[PDB]
Amino acid sequence: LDQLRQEAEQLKNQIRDARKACADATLSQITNNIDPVGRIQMRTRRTLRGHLAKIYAMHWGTDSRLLVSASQDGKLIIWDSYTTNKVHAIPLRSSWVMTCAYAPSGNYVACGGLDNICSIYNLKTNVRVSRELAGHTGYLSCCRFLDDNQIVTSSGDTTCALWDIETGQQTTTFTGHTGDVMSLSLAPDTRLFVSGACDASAKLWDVREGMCRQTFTGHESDINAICFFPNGNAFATGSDDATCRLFDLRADQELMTYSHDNIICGITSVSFSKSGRLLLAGYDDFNCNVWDALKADRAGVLAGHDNRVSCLGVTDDGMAVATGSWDSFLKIWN
Amino acid sequence: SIAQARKLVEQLKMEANIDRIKVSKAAADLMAYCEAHAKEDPLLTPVPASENPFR
Amino acid sequence: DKAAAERSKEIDKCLSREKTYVKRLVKILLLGADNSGKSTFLKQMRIGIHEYDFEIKNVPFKMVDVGGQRSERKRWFECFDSVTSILFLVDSSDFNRLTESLNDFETIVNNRVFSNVSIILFLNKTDLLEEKVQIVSIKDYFLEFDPHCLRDVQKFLVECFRNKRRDQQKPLYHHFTTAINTENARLIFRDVKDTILHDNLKQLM
Amino acid sequence: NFAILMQVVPLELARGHQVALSSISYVGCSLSVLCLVATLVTFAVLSSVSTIRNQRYHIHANLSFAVLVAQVLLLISFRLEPGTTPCQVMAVLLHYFFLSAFAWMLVEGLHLYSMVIKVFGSEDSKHRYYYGMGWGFPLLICIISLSFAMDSYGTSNNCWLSLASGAIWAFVAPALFVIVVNIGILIAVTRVISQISADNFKLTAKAVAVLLPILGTSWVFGVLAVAVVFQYMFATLNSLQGLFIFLFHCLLNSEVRAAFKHKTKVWSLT
């Protein structure tokens, strides 16, 4: 055991030099004369309301029009962004929900929280539970619909697992992300997904198998959120070190770190723009800082929330960005 | 936890041979995607009010 | 075209209908141990997180109970940042288990998340230690502490828990009660009423 | 002078000193208007935050606006020719707005109670009655007041109701009722805040002082002229009321300042 423990260290040293060996130049160096992003003077084009308590989760839909949201009131509200009407209000068996998800088909909505079970609500029939999952050891942190039939989850047990409504049992669980996985995202090509945990590192996983292939790291704190580039080739992890950063698959290393001297609050949600030029990122300073993804320019500010912003999302159509804050409000920015 | 110890080295070995391309080549790839779809971004270039649902 | 607006109006009623209840609801976090006799304490209120909604003197409450599910992750604690007090139970007679109870108190009361909340300290088993007093000297274990007087022993436990709090945004309470005392619910009502009074006073002046 | 509001005994005063009471009433009531102008706008502009939008700040704003118009409506009632029809036209409005001004003091008083001695439920919305007794009850009295003695308006030295057929009672008696309750609320509130002012004593003095402009306990000195020394005390205690609302609930409140500092951040970062 002692020899194996010492042997494990020397493998990473070569792997650490592998990033150095493949490194060519800093992305900043790569992008010096690239067109300036310009001042995006975005304003508020909608302001939804009706949530009793603070919002923790919000996720758009593939139909570009409906968006779901969850709060400590124990209710899920489905909103029509175009017309600011309320479609469904979903009571929950529990009252401590920490994540929500929307089916691309639109017939189901996932919700989970401190309860070990995240509910898969049936939306097409008001709304009832299609299936309540078997459960994990801790609390579900982020739920996403890989497809209408497969569900991927992140819990408080350093455990992620692909699910299945048909069998009602986790088909292929995933283990290895020490700490507490709190973030999860899916690739536009639905065969990969990564996660972020309190281990100050993120790991890349393959759905068809159950073993991770890559492990991006360097964060000075716990990762609270993550999202993928429009192509399946980049990342954006937002941790509590007040520094989002860009990652690359083939590079297997960070490209640029997004931080500003007056920015010490931290990050709660992160999302890209449709063109991949902008890195929309919320902050615990009750603000939403937009950044040039191609560059590192911290250009584009989006203020107007009274309390912390915790959830952020960009429509698949790319028209508008949505922010939900602890103020119990959720307003669409375009 | 020998198995676990076996797992880490095994995992390290799995990624020990990670295939990789030039970092600049991957970095330059991000430039092409950003440039190609810049004209079709409803959020970067200000949206024409004639079709914006939030205008 | 009209059912969409109709659904909103019907939905907005229930959300508005529930606002009065939620805004007036009092949430209390219950933390303790197996020796604290929570099951014995909870039955008096009747007359892994469990929800106990009760009402004495025409006011609702919420005994949210983290059944040993205490987590270290920070995001766990903002799931309970909406509470207005924390009811804390320790077995007074369990002298040998006071060391872990002392350490347990530090994590909750001194976490920046649960700040702005009051602490309602309870010392159950108030008659079990009665005999221990003058029989087993708490000073034999807590050398920092006459050892055979109840009042000195009774007041020594509070000084340990009270001083274990770090730097006082909200006051700390203490009540020595039996597991079957009929005044238990009354004591919380007086303590929670004072807790919201201080909050309102800030706002007012 | 502003002291005519509470007069119930027709006492004469020295014409040399008449300017002295009128001068303080002029400057006192003039500042109370302009100083309240900032209060109304700063509540609207800072209404973008939760610390401002609340069940109470509707009370302060409505009271501020009711006193705002009532004060400024009084300046034009002085210079306006006594006894004429326009004097009778607009002196009804002084009776209604001051009664509405006092109604909001009681609403503020009835809200101090539910937050301090009836602490549980202090956040439940009760706008259906606060707006009701805030304006509807003053309207109910004025219709009775006008029907009983419409002629009472004017028909005297000045456009303020004459103290002859008891017309003065239409405003003085309801003012006394609002004073008594607010004094009663103030005592109970002071008892419960003084108890928490034990050794750890100027806090208990500031607590009552900030409640004077919103409870209307300074109008007691108005009826005490029955003598002239209290008339002077009535021409500077409530005459400059608008200044007191600004300096205790608009420019010195921590909540309004915290709301202000938040809005300077969003405006600068835009």
Side-chain angles (χ1 to χ4, degrees), chain A residues 4 7-8 10-11 13-15 17-18 21-28 31 36-38 40 42 44-45 47-48 50-92 94-114 117-123 125 127 129-130 133-165 167-190 192-202 204-213 215-219 221-252 255-284 286-293 296-297 299-305 307-318 320-326 328-334, chain B residues 1-3 5 9 16-18 20-21 23-24 26-34 36-38 40-54, chain C residues 1 3-5 8 11-12 14-16 19-22 25-35 37-56 58-68 70-71 76-96 98-111 114-131 135-136 138 142-147 149-150 152-154 156-161 163-165 169 171-185 187-189 191-198 200-205, chain D residues 2-3 6-8 10 13-14 16 19-20 23-33 35-50 52-78 80 82-87 90-117 119-121 125 127 130-136 138-139 141-143 145 147 149 152-156 159-190 192-194 196-201 203-205 207-223 225 227-228 230-232 234-237 239-250 252-254 256-260 262-264 266 268 270:
Chain A
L4 187 59
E7 188 168 359
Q10 70 94 26
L11 271 78
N13 308 141
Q14 173 253 322
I15 298 314
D17 299 324
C22 74
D24 293 332
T26 64
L27 192 37
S28 55
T31 53
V37 64
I40 296 90
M42 185 180 288
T44 174
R45 323 321 290 261
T47 301
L48 277 296
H51 262 284
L52 273 181
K54 57 185 72 177
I55 296 293
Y56 292 169
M58 171 261 304
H59 175 222
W60 268 111
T62 63
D63 61 358
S64 173
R65 191 186 202 218
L66 312 180
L67 73 165
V68 74
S69 315
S71 162
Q72 295 294 321
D73 59 347
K75 315 214 191 324
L76 266 171
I77 307 173
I78 279 180
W79 272 327
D80 177 10
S81 188
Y82 283 11
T83 70
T84 72
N85 321 127
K86 291 186 179 68
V87 183
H88 281 114
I90 278 164
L92 312 168
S94 72
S95 68
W96 290 287
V97 55
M98 267 196 53
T99 180
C100 70
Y102 192 83
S105 164
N107 308 62
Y108 306 99
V109 160
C111 66
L114 283 186
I117 297 169
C118 63
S119 297
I120 301 299
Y121 271 86
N122 194 353
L123 210 60
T125 51
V127 176
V129 298
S130 87
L133 296 178
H136 307 175
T137 299
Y139 65 105
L140 277 296
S141 51
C142 171
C143 202
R144 240 77 172 173
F145 273 128
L146 187 153
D147 201 75
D148 201 7
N149 194 1
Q150 282 74 239
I151 307 96
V152 63
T153 53
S154 60
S155 201
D157 322 310
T158 59
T159 307
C160 274
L162 183 63
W163 265 98
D164 192 359
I165 301 302
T167 186
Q169 184 273 356
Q170 65 183 357
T171 55
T172 305
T173 170
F174 317 108
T175 37
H177 216 18
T178 299
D180 196 307
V181 46
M182 326 207 268
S183 66
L184 189 144
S185 195
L186 307 175
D189 57 355
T190 313
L192 293 172
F193 80 99
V194 308
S195 74
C198 297
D199 52 4
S201 164
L204 159 65
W205 309 71
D206 194 1
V207 174
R208 297 291 185 269
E209 65 183 1
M211 65 182 179
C212 64
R213 278 178 322 96
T215 302
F216 300 83
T217 182
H219 256 332
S221 192
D222 312 336
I223 295 99
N224 297 115
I226 204 160
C227 182
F228 292 169
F229 201 84
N231 53 51
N233 296 115
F235 300 102
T237 181
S239 170
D240 266 329
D241 49 0
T243 306
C244 294
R245 43 193 78 159
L246 178 64
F247 280 130
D248 267 346
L249 301 184
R250 269 67 52 87
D252 276 325
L255 266 294
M256 294 182 286
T257 66
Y258 310 104
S259 179
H260 191 273
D261 55 350
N262 59 19
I263 302 299
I264 62 100
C265 61
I267 301 108
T268 50
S269 196
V270 63
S271 171
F272 290 94
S273 182
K274 193 183 171 333
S275 82
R277 194 36 180 281
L278 286 192
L279 191 43
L280 273 288
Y283 281 89
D284 301 63
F286 314 159
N287 300 299
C288 199
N289 274 297
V290 195
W291 293 57
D292 186 322
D297 185 4
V301 280
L302 296 179
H305 271 307
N307 204 297
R308 310 250 281 279
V309 63
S310 64
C311 59
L312 178 78
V314 166
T315 294
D316 288 331
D317 203 12
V321 68
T323 78
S325 72
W326 281 9
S328 75
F329 292 146
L330 191 150
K331 65 178 72 66
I332 319 302
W333 286 340
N334 188 358
Chain B
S1 159
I2 62 100
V9 277
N17 41 84
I18 286 181
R20 301 178 189 93
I21 81 170
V23 162
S24 44
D29 167 68
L30 270 300
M31 186 66 204
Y33 206 103
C34 290
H37 302 61
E40 74 159 13
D41 190 343
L43 193 149
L44 183 63
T45 307
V47 58
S50 45
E51 55 92 20
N52 175 26
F54 311 106
Chain C
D1 56 348
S8 83
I11 284 299
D12 288 330
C14 302
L15 312 183
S16 179
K19 179 159 91 206
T20 64
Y21 180 88
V22 176
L25 183 63
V26 176
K27 297 179 182 208
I28 297 169
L29 177 64
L30 175 44
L31 307 175
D34 57 22
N35 63 7
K38 317 192 152 287
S39 170
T40 315
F41 184 89
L42 266 294
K43 296 183 289 294
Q44 293 300 105
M45 295 298 102
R46 311 209 50 69
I47 308 85
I49 313 173
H50 296 285
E51 174 180 359
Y52 294 75
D53 192 358
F54 64 91
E55 169 265 330
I56 294 90
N58 198 1
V59 71
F61 279 103
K62 177 63 69 70
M63 294 300 293
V64 296
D65 176 71
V66 171
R70 332 273 272 257
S71 178
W76 189 69
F77 287 120
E78 291 85 4
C79 281
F80 302 122
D81 63 358
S82 66
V83 298
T84 188
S85 66
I86 297 169
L87 191 154
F88 198 84
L89 288 152
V90 298
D91 197 303
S92 46
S93 69
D94 214 2
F95 280 157
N96 56 5
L98 294 174
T99 299
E100 54 92 22
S101 296
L102 275 159
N103 290 318
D104 189 358
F105 201 85
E106 268 274 353
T107 305
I108 295 90
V109 72
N110 288 328
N111 191 319
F114 272 144
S115 158
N116 318 126
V117 175
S118 53
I119 301 299
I120 297 169
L121 180 63
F122 273 8
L123 279 82
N124 191 312
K125 311 306 192 77
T126 188
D127 43 358
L128 282 72
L129 62 80
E130 168 49 55
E131 32 274 20
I135 285 321
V136 170
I138 184 61
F142 292 165
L143 268 297
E144 71 271 16
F145 171 69
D146 59 356
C149 179
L150 169 66
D152 278 0
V153 160
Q154 183 94 340
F156 172 64
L157 294 174
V158 166
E159 193 274 331
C160 294
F161 280 175
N163 200 358
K164 200 70 177 294
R165 210 200 189 262
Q169 287 195 358
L172 181 139
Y173 293 99
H174 70 78
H175 295 273
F176 303 88
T177 180
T178 74
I180 64 171
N181 189 359
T182 61
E183 295 293 327
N184 293 334
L187 294 174
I188 308 284
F189 176 82
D191 294 339
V192 176
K193 182 150 167 221
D194 189 358
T195 300
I196 297 169
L197 161 63
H198 277 236
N200 296 135
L201 263 175
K202 179 62 173 171
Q203 292 181 88
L204 283 151
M205 274 109 60
Chain D
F2 194 11
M6 297 296 180
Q7 228 81 52
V8 293
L13 188 153
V19 188
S23 51
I24 304 184
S25 170
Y26 284 163
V27 62
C29 195
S30 80
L31 277 296
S32 160
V33 170
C35 200
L36 265 181
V37 176
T39 65
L40 271 295
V41 288
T42 199
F43 288 166
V45 65
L46 294 191
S47 295
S48 190
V49 298
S50 66
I52 301 299
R53 288 185 290 112
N54 193 358
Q55 194 202 358
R56 45 140 150 174
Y57 292 96
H58 291 339
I59 297 169
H60 282 347
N62 284 294
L63 186 144
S64 310
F65 180 67
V67 184
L68 157 71
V69 185
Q71 294 300 320
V72 67
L73 184 62
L74 183 63
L75 277 296
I76 61 170
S77 176
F78 291 166
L80 190 153
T84 191
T85 305
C87 177
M90 58 88 69
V92 193
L93 295 176
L94 290 174
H95 173 233
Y96 176 75
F97 270 50
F98 274 128
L99 215 53
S100 89
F102 266 101
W104 279 110
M105 308 190 176
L106 186 61
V107 162
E108 187 44 66
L110 294 174
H111 201 66
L112 191 43
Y113 177 105
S114 62
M115 288 174 69
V116 172
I117 193 66
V119 179
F120 278 147
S125 55
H127 302 77
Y130 276 176
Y131 281 156
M133 188 270 285
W135 304 95
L139 197 58
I141 300 149
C142 278
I143 300 299
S145 308
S147 82
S152 268
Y153 280 112
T155 59
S156 189
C159 294
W160 185 232
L161 62 80
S162 76
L163 62 80
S165 186
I168 201 48
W169 297 134
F171 162 77
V172 175
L176 286 190
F177 194 110
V178 168
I179 282 170
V180 166
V181 163
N182 284 342
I183 288 277
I185 295 284
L186 186 46
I187 279 173
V189 160
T190 304
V192 76
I193 182 168
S194 56
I196 294 169
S197 192
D199 189 12
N200 303 111
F201 202 61
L203 300 182
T204 187
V208 54
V210 65
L211 293 168
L212 260 69
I214 79 178
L215 288 171
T217 62
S218 296
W219 302 64
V220 176
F221 301 86
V223 287
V228 69
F230 287 98
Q231 291 286 281
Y232 274 90
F234 178 75
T236 185
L237 271 206
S239 88
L240 274 157
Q241 195 145 354
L243 183 63
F244 294 156
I245 305 285
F246 182 56
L247 262 70
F248 290 81
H249 304 73
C250 171
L252 267 71
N253 197 359
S254 179
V256 65
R257 290 212 284 129
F260 210 69
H262 181 280
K263 297 295 302 311
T264 63
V266 60
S268 65
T270 301

